[PDB]
Amino acid sequence: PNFEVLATFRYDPGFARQSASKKEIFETPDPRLGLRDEDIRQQIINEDYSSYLRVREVNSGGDLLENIQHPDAWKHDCKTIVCQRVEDMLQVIYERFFLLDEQYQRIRIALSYFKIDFSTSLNDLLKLLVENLINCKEGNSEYHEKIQKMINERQCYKMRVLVSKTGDIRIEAIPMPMEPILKLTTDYDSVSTYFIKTMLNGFLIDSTINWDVVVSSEPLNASAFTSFKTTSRDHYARARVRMQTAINNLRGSEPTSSVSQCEILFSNKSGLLMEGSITNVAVIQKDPNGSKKYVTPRLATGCLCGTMRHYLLRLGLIEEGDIDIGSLTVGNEVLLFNGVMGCIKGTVKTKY
Ligand SMILES: *Cc1c(COP(=O)(O)O)cnc(C)c1O
């Protein structure tokens, strides 16, 4: 096939916001929330992309989970002085792209693996993303003014970066809606709180989002097209058609009807749980004394090395483990995650 390597990630103005009190200040989430990881920043400076694959040995995360579960208590936003200069503005926009550094490392690994020539730096990619958002090229007389205008806007986008076999980059920005209450009241809480409610919702005690999950009877073959993210997705598309059948059976609607707020989980040929069609997964386990642990499949299963998965691992919020697909039963709680919507709850509702 003539596939493209694919990266999709949130652009969210609420992640780097002009201070309401002082106009020279932009506010970003508390450093504990790990959006600006120094190690990863240095890895990129050093052209070290393969470190993205390395398992960060152990974590003193836990306690972070307790704190996240009190999302309104976060008052310590990071504050940065931002002038009306292009560099400062590009940096604000960069900080609104969710896990762009991690997306960058993964795309470089995939491109190297598929032997696709590539020489676009992270800073050059950022400029391309900006040109897409403002519909204007660097060097145009209106570039500066259009950057200022776009920055003031509050529209979220799902960004899609596609790299062809010849290394050509195409970018799309797909507008995405916000939950109405968050949209109305975003200005009243910290950026940290906004971030937690938007992207770590799955961890919250009183979350309302809860996708219905199908456990598939059909294994997938692990391949380069599962371990990496690309447009060659016939295997996931088949799973999603089967998800549709199962969810419609469950909900009592015609098998051909559209379905939403649902996901399908599948195993590899050895029967180990891999991932969902559009998310990585963590299953909820317990140990005495009944404390929850969130356990996510290892990359050895063939699942995608998701950026949201990587983020949650380095924060210590999930941990790797081996889960037999046969262990999931109706009623089981899971977490589902990707770099667009972050982490949400799901519940196993049917098997098919
Ligand atoms: C997008 C996707 C994920 C999640 O990857 P992120 O980098 O977190 O967005 C997981 N599995 C599959 C099959 C996907 O397409």
Short mmCIF file of N, CA, C and O in Angstrom, two decimals, residues 114-211:
data_model
loop_
_atom_site.label_atom_id
_atom_site.label_comp_id
_atom_site.label_asym_id
_atom_site.label_seq_id
_atom_site.Cartn_x
_atom_site.Cartn_y
_atom_site.Cartn_z
N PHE A 114 10.61 2.82 8.63
CA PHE A 114 10.08 2.65 7.27
C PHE A 114 11.03 3.15 6.17
O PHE A 114 10.68 3.12 4.99
N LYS A 115 12.22 3.62 6.55
CA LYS A 115 13.24 4.12 5.60
C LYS A 115 12.73 5.27 4.71
O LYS A 115 12.94 5.29 3.50
N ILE A 116 12.07 6.23 5.35
CA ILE A 116 11.58 7.41 4.68
C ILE A 116 12.51 8.56 5.06
O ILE A 116 12.67 8.87 6.25
N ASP A 117 13.13 9.18 4.06
CA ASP A 117 14.02 10.32 4.28
C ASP A 117 13.28 11.47 4.93
O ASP A 117 12.16 11.80 4.54
N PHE A 118 13.91 12.10 5.91
CA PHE A 118 13.26 13.16 6.67
C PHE A 118 14.29 14.06 7.30
O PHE A 118 15.24 13.59 7.89
N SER A 119 14.09 15.37 7.19
CA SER A 119 15.07 16.28 7.73
C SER A 119 14.41 17.51 8.34
O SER A 119 15.05 18.54 8.53
N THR A 120 13.12 17.41 8.63
CA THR A 120 12.42 18.53 9.22
C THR A 120 12.63 18.51 10.73
O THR A 120 12.22 17.56 11.41
N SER A 121 13.24 19.56 11.26
CA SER A 121 13.45 19.67 12.71
C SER A 121 12.11 19.87 13.42
O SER A 121 11.09 20.22 12.78
N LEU A 122 12.11 19.68 14.74
CA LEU A 122 10.91 19.98 15.54
C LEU A 122 10.52 21.45 15.40
O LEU A 122 9.33 21.76 15.23
N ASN A 123 11.49 22.36 15.45
CA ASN A 123 11.14 23.77 15.25
C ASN A 123 10.54 24.05 13.87
O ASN A 123 9.60 24.85 13.74
N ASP A 124 11.07 23.41 12.83
CA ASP A 124 10.48 23.54 11.49
C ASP A 124 9.07 22.94 11.41
O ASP A 124 8.18 23.49 10.75
N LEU A 125 8.85 21.82 12.08
CA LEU A 125 7.50 21.25 12.13
C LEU A 125 6.52 22.20 12.84
O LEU A 125 5.39 22.39 12.38
N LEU A 126 6.95 22.77 13.95
CA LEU A 126 6.14 23.74 14.67
C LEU A 126 5.71 24.90 13.75
O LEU A 126 4.56 25.29 13.71
N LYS A 127 6.67 25.45 13.01
CA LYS A 127 6.36 26.51 12.04
C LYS A 127 5.36 26.07 10.98
O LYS A 127 4.48 26.85 10.60
N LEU A 128 5.47 24.82 10.52
CA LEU A 128 4.49 24.28 9.58
C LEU A 128 3.10 24.20 10.20
O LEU A 128 2.10 24.49 9.54
N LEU A 129 3.04 23.80 11.47
CA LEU A 129 1.76 23.69 12.18
C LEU A 129 1.15 25.08 12.30
O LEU A 129 -0.07 25.25 12.15
N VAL A 130 1.99 26.06 12.59
CA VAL A 130 1.52 27.44 12.74
C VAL A 130 0.98 27.95 11.39
O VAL A 130 -0.11 28.52 11.32
N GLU A 131 1.74 27.73 10.32
CA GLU A 131 1.29 28.14 8.98
C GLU A 131 -0.07 27.55 8.61
O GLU A 131 -0.94 28.23 8.05
N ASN A 132 -0.28 26.29 8.99
CA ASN A 132 -1.58 25.68 8.79
C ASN A 132 -2.68 26.40 9.58
O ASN A 132 -3.73 26.73 9.02
N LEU A 133 -2.43 26.67 10.86
CA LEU A 133 -3.44 27.28 11.73
C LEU A 133 -3.81 28.71 11.29
O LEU A 133 -4.96 29.10 11.37
N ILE A 134 -2.82 29.46 10.80
CA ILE A 134 -3.08 30.86 10.40
C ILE A 134 -3.35 31.02 8.91
O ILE A 134 -3.72 32.11 8.46
N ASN A 135 -3.16 29.94 8.15
CA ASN A 135 -3.32 29.96 6.70
C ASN A 135 -2.44 31.07 6.09
O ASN A 135 -2.90 31.88 5.28
N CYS A 136 -1.17 31.10 6.48
CA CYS A 136 -0.27 32.14 6.02
C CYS A 136 1.17 31.68 6.20
O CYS A 136 1.49 31.02 7.19
N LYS A 137 2.03 32.01 5.25
CA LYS A 137 3.41 31.56 5.32
C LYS A 137 4.33 32.58 5.97
O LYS A 137 4.13 33.80 5.83
N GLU A 138 5.34 32.09 6.68
CA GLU A 138 6.43 32.94 7.16
C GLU A 138 6.98 33.76 5.99
O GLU A 138 7.08 33.27 4.87
N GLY A 139 7.27 35.04 6.24
CA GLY A 139 7.72 35.92 5.17
C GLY A 139 6.62 36.78 4.58
O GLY A 139 6.91 37.83 4.02
N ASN A 140 5.36 36.35 4.69
CA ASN A 140 4.23 37.17 4.23
C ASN A 140 4.08 38.37 5.14
O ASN A 140 4.30 38.25 6.34
N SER A 141 3.72 39.53 4.59
CA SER A 141 3.63 40.74 5.40
C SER A 141 2.62 40.63 6.56
O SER A 141 2.76 41.31 7.57
N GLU A 142 1.63 39.76 6.42
CA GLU A 142 0.59 39.63 7.44
C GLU A 142 0.82 38.51 8.46
O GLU A 142 -0.02 38.28 9.34
N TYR A 143 1.95 37.81 8.33
CA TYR A 143 2.27 36.67 9.18
C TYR A 143 2.19 37.02 10.67
O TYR A 143 1.52 36.33 11.44
N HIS A 144 2.89 38.08 11.07
CA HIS A 144 2.94 38.52 12.47
C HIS A 144 1.56 38.85 13.02
O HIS A 144 1.19 38.38 14.11
N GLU A 145 0.80 39.66 12.29
CA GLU A 145 -0.54 40.03 12.73
C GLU A 145 -1.46 38.80 12.81
O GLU A 145 -2.27 38.68 13.73
N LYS A 146 -1.34 37.89 11.85
CA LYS A 146 -2.19 36.69 11.86
C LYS A 146 -1.84 35.73 13.00
O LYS A 146 -2.72 35.06 13.55
N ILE A 147 -0.56 35.69 13.39
CA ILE A 147 -0.19 34.92 14.57
C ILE A 147 -0.84 35.49 15.83
O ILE A 147 -1.42 34.73 16.63
N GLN A 148 -0.76 36.80 16.02
CA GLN A 148 -1.42 37.46 17.16
C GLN A 148 -2.92 37.18 17.19
O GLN A 148 -3.47 36.85 18.24
N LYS A 149 -3.57 37.28 16.03
CA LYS A 149 -5.02 37.08 15.92
C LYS A 149 -5.39 35.63 16.28
O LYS A 149 -6.32 35.38 17.05
N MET A 150 -4.65 34.67 15.72
CA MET A 150 -4.97 33.25 15.93
C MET A 150 -4.79 32.89 17.39
O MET A 150 -5.65 32.20 17.97
N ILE A 151 -3.70 33.36 18.00
CA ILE A 151 -3.44 33.14 19.42
C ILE A 151 -4.59 33.55 20.35
O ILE A 151 -4.87 32.84 21.33
N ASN A 152 -5.25 34.67 20.06
CA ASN A 152 -6.36 35.14 20.88
C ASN A 152 -7.60 34.25 20.76
O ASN A 152 -8.49 34.31 21.60
N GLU A 153 -7.65 33.42 19.72
CA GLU A 153 -8.81 32.58 19.48
C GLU A 153 -8.88 31.41 20.46
O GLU A 153 -7.87 31.00 21.02
N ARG A 154 -10.07 30.88 20.67
CA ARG A 154 -10.27 29.85 21.70
C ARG A 154 -10.70 28.51 21.15
O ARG A 154 -11.07 27.61 21.92
N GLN A 155 -10.67 28.38 19.83
CA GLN A 155 -11.00 27.11 19.17
C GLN A 155 -9.93 26.04 19.42
O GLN A 155 -8.73 26.27 19.17
N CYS A 156 -10.36 24.87 19.90
CA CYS A 156 -9.53 23.66 19.94
C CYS A 156 -9.52 22.96 18.58
O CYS A 156 -10.54 22.97 17.85
N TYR A 157 -8.39 22.34 18.26
CA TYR A 157 -8.29 21.49 17.04
C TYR A 157 -7.67 20.13 17.31
O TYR A 157 -6.78 19.99 18.17
N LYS A 158 -8.11 19.14 16.53
CA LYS A 158 -7.34 17.91 16.40
C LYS A 158 -6.41 18.14 15.22
O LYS A 158 -6.89 18.34 14.09
N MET A 159 -5.11 18.16 15.49
CA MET A 159 -4.08 18.30 14.47
C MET A 159 -3.77 16.92 13.88
O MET A 159 -3.69 15.93 14.62
N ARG A 160 -3.61 16.85 12.57
CA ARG A 160 -3.15 15.63 11.92
C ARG A 160 -1.94 15.95 11.04
O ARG A 160 -2.00 16.84 10.17
N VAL A 161 -0.85 15.25 11.30
CA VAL A 161 0.37 15.40 10.52
C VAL A 161 0.55 14.07 9.78
O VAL A 161 0.54 12.99 10.40
N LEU A 162 0.69 14.15 8.46
CA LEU A 162 0.84 12.98 7.61
C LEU A 162 2.15 13.14 6.85
O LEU A 162 2.38 14.19 6.27
N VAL A 163 3.00 12.11 6.87
CA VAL A 163 4.27 12.14 6.14
C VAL A 163 4.27 10.98 5.14
O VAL A 163 4.13 9.80 5.52
N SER A 164 4.38 11.33 3.85
CA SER A 164 4.32 10.35 2.75
C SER A 164 5.65 9.58 2.63
O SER A 164 6.64 9.95 3.25
N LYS A 165 5.66 8.53 1.81
CA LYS A 165 6.87 7.73 1.61
C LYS A 165 8.04 8.51 1.03
O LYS A 165 9.19 8.08 1.16
N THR A 166 7.76 9.65 0.40
CA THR A 166 8.81 10.53 -0.11
C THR A 166 9.19 11.60 0.91
O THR A 166 10.00 12.47 0.61
N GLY A 167 8.59 11.54 2.09
CA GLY A 167 8.89 12.48 3.16
C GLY A 167 8.13 13.80 3.15
O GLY A 167 8.44 14.69 3.94
N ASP A 168 7.15 13.93 2.26
CA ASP A 168 6.35 15.15 2.15
C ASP A 168 5.38 15.23 3.31
O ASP A 168 4.74 14.24 3.66
N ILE A 169 5.27 16.42 3.90
CA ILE A 169 4.42 16.61 5.08
C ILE A 169 3.13 17.30 4.68
O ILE A 169 3.17 18.31 3.97
N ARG A 170 1.99 16.76 5.12
CA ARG A 170 0.71 17.43 4.98
C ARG A 170 0.08 17.58 6.36
O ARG A 170 0.20 16.67 7.20
N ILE A 171 -0.55 18.72 6.61
CA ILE A 171 -1.14 19.01 7.91
C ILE A 171 -2.61 19.35 7.79
O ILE A 171 -3.00 20.07 6.87
N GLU A 172 -3.42 18.83 8.71
CA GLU A 172 -4.83 19.22 8.82
C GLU A 172 -5.15 19.64 10.25
O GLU A 172 -4.58 19.09 11.20
N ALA A 173 -6.01 20.63 10.40
CA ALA A 173 -6.52 21.01 11.71
C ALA A 173 -8.04 20.84 11.70
O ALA A 173 -8.73 21.54 10.97
N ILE A 174 -8.54 19.90 12.49
CA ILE A 174 -9.96 19.60 12.53
C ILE A 174 -10.55 20.23 13.80
O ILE A 174 -10.13 19.88 14.91
N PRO A 175 -11.52 21.14 13.64
CA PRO A 175 -12.08 21.83 14.80
C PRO A 175 -12.73 20.82 15.73
O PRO A 175 -13.41 19.91 15.26
N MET A 176 -12.49 20.96 17.02
CA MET A 176 -13.15 20.11 17.98
C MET A 176 -13.84 20.91 19.10
O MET A 176 -13.29 21.90 19.59
N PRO A 177 -15.02 20.46 19.50
CA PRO A 177 -15.85 21.17 20.48
C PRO A 177 -15.37 20.90 21.89
O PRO A 177 -14.71 19.87 22.13
N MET A 178 -15.68 21.81 22.81
CA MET A 178 -15.39 21.61 24.23
C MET A 178 -16.69 21.21 24.93
O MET A 178 -17.78 21.56 24.46
N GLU A 179 -16.56 20.50 26.05
CA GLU A 179 -17.71 20.22 26.91
C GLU A 179 -18.29 21.58 27.36
O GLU A 179 -17.52 22.47 27.73
N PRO A 180 -19.63 21.74 27.29
CA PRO A 180 -20.21 23.09 27.48
C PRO A 180 -19.88 23.76 28.81
O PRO A 180 -19.61 24.97 28.84
N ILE A 181 -19.86 22.99 29.90
CA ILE A 181 -19.60 23.58 31.21
C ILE A 181 -18.14 24.05 31.29
O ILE A 181 -17.86 25.17 31.74
N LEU A 182 -17.21 23.24 30.79
CA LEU A 182 -15.80 23.65 30.74
C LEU A 182 -15.61 24.88 29.87
O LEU A 182 -14.82 25.75 30.21
N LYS A 183 -16.35 24.96 28.76
CA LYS A 183 -16.23 26.09 27.84
C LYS A 183 -16.66 27.38 28.53
O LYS A 183 -15.98 28.40 28.44
N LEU A 184 -17.75 27.30 29.28
CA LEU A 184 -18.31 28.45 29.96
C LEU A 184 -17.43 28.97 31.10
O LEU A 184 -17.35 30.18 31.32
N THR A 185 -16.78 28.06 31.81
CA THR A 185 -16.19 28.39 33.10
C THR A 185 -14.66 28.25 33.11
O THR A 185 -14.06 28.40 34.18
N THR A 186 -14.06 28.00 31.95
CA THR A 186 -12.60 27.82 31.86
C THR A 186 -11.81 28.98 32.49
O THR A 186 -10.79 28.75 33.17
N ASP A 187 -12.28 30.21 32.32
CA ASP A 187 -11.58 31.39 32.86
C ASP A 187 -11.55 31.44 34.38
O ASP A 187 -10.72 32.17 34.96
N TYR A 188 -12.43 30.69 35.04
CA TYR A 188 -12.59 30.81 36.49
C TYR A 188 -11.70 29.87 37.28
O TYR A 188 -11.51 30.06 38.47
N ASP A 189 -11.16 28.86 36.63
CA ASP A 189 -10.26 27.97 37.34
C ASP A 189 -8.85 28.12 36.74
O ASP A 189 -8.66 28.80 35.74
N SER A 190 -7.86 27.50 37.37
CA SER A 190 -6.49 27.60 36.90
C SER A 190 -6.36 26.83 35.58
O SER A 190 -7.24 26.06 35.20
N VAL A 191 -5.25 27.05 34.90
CA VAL A 191 -4.91 26.29 33.71
C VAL A 191 -4.68 24.82 34.10
O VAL A 191 -5.05 23.91 33.34
N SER A 192 -4.05 24.59 35.26
CA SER A 192 -3.82 23.23 35.78
C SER A 192 -5.13 22.48 35.92
O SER A 192 -5.27 21.36 35.46
N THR A 193 -6.11 23.14 36.54
CA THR A 193 -7.42 22.55 36.71
C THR A 193 -8.10 22.26 35.36
O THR A 193 -8.72 21.18 35.18
N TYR A 194 -8.03 23.22 34.44
CA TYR A 194 -8.60 23.02 33.09
C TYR A 194 -7.96 21.78 32.45
O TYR A 194 -8.63 20.92 31.87
N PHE A 195 -6.63 21.70 32.56
CA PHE A 195 -5.91 20.62 31.93
C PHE A 195 -6.35 19.26 32.50
O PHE A 195 -6.61 18.33 31.75
N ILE A 196 -6.44 19.18 33.83
CA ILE A 196 -6.83 17.92 34.50
C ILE A 196 -8.26 17.51 34.07
O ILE A 196 -8.50 16.35 33.74
N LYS A 197 -9.18 18.46 34.07
CA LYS A 197 -10.57 18.15 33.71
C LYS A 197 -10.73 17.75 32.24
O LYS A 197 -11.62 16.97 31.89
N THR A 198 -9.85 18.25 31.39
CA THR A 198 -9.94 18.01 29.94
C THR A 198 -9.25 16.72 29.52
O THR A 198 -9.77 15.98 28.65
N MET A 199 -8.08 16.45 30.11
CA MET A 199 -7.18 15.39 29.66
C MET A 199 -6.97 14.25 30.65
O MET A 199 -6.46 13.21 30.26
N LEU A 200 -7.35 14.45 31.92
CA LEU A 200 -7.15 13.38 32.93
C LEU A 200 -8.49 13.01 33.57
O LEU A 200 -8.55 12.50 34.70
N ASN A 201 -9.55 13.22 32.80
CA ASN A 201 -10.91 13.00 33.27
C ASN A 201 -11.16 11.58 33.79
O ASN A 201 -11.89 11.38 34.78
N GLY A 202 -10.52 10.62 33.13
CA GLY A 202 -10.62 9.19 33.47
C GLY A 202 -10.22 8.88 34.91
O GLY A 202 -10.66 7.87 35.46
N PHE A 203 -9.40 9.72 35.50
CA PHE A 203 -8.93 9.51 36.88
C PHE A 203 -9.86 10.11 37.93
O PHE A 203 -9.78 9.77 39.11
N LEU A 204 -10.73 11.02 37.51
CA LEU A 204 -11.58 11.76 38.47
C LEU A 204 -12.68 10.90 39.06
O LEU A 204 -13.31 10.10 38.37
N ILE A 205 -12.89 11.06 40.37
CA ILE A 205 -13.86 10.27 41.09
C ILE A 205 -15.28 10.48 40.52
O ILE A 205 -16.04 9.53 40.37
N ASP A 206 -15.61 11.71 40.14
CA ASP A 206 -16.98 12.07 39.75
C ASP A 206 -17.12 12.36 38.26
O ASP A 206 -17.99 13.15 37.84
N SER A 207 -16.28 11.73 37.45
CA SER A 207 -16.39 11.90 36.00
C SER A 207 -17.70 11.31 35.49
O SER A 207 -18.23 10.36 36.06
N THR A 208 -18.24 11.90 34.42
CA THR A 208 -19.47 11.39 33.81
C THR A 208 -19.21 10.62 32.49
O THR A 208 -19.97 9.73 32.14
N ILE A 209 -18.13 10.95 31.78
CA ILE A 209 -17.77 10.23 30.55
C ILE A 209 -17.38 8.79 30.85
O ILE A 209 -16.50 8.53 31.68
N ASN A 210 -18.02 7.86 30.17
CA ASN A 210 -17.77 6.45 30.39
C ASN A 210 -18.15 5.66 29.16
O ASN A 210 -19.33 5.35 28.96
N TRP A 211 -17.17 5.34 28.32
CA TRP A 211 -17.48 4.66 27.06
C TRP A 211 -17.83 3.22 27.25
O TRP A 211 -17.30 2.54 28.13
#
